[model samples]
Target: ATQPATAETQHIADQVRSQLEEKENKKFPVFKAVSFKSQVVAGTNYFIKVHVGDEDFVHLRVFQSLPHENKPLTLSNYQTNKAKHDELTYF
Candidate 1:
């Protein structure tokens, strides 16, 4: 289920900001993590909202590995050019 962003989610999102930048072909000097939704499976899929500019936001689908695996978070998908009202839909 989706929920508001937390310090943990924000930290995770920040870790993969570079990956999102690469995929979007842009950079964000003032990125902010706004909110997130989490899915539990073998690992967790974090559907996260990122505020990149004034009234502009982006959504990131980040994959987190189980603790035993020690795998780094992966940016599996994303949606850009979104507003605060966006539902944080799955991409």
Candidate 2:
């Protein structure tokens, strides 16, 4: 079952906070929390938005950086390769 987040999406916020703190590399004040909001997109996609300090960030960067070949092919392998090529264009 899925549900919309209320007030604060605590689990996501904590996870992102922990990751950020860990990545801060002991730069001082290593643990800083952020607010998170989650929304269901269409029917299958979920979008999460996080706000920390004065910055608003979305977790989509992880998906955006995903390797195109890492997933099971939804279309033909050749089509996937064509998509990779299409993703880059010389202009």
Candidate 3:
């Protein structure tokens, strides 16, 4: 069974969703929560897969701080058209 999302995770997800809404001028629904484990870096990372019409999808990566605070969620990676939007996906 999938574990329930924590309050912090939900808050981060909501924040990202709202930002995308304003940026795209459209509603983006959270499709699912994806597990992202990177051996390349430390710290906990949260991933939320979002639907963006068609078959394309965007994912947010919210990095957690060493303490309790969490960093802002970012469009670290996404699958979409438009070169500019694709560029923004990279860190």
Please tell me which predicted candidate would have the highest lDDT against the true structure.
Answer: 1
TM-score of 2: 0.29
Total backbone collisions, model 3:
0
- TM-score, per-candidate, Cα-based: 0.92, 0.29, 0.42
Q: Given candidate 3, what's the lDDT at residue 90?
A: 26
**In every candidate, how many clashes are there?**
0, 0, 0
Q: Is candidate 1 or candidate 3 better by lDDT?
A: 1
The candidate with the higher TM-score, 1 or 3, is 1
Ranking by TM-score: 1, 3, 2
Model 3 quality (TM-score):
0.42
- Comparing 1 with 2 on TM-score, the higher-scoring candidate is 1
Write one digit per residue (lDDT tens) for candidate 3, span 62-84: 55444555565554443434321
Each prediction's Cα lDDT score?
0.88, 0.28, 0.48
Q: Write the per-residue lDDT of candidate 1 for residues 1-91, one digit (tens) a residue.
A: 6688889988999999999888878899678888888888899899999999889998898999999999999998888889999898887
State the weakest 10-residue window (summed lDDT) of model 2. 75-84
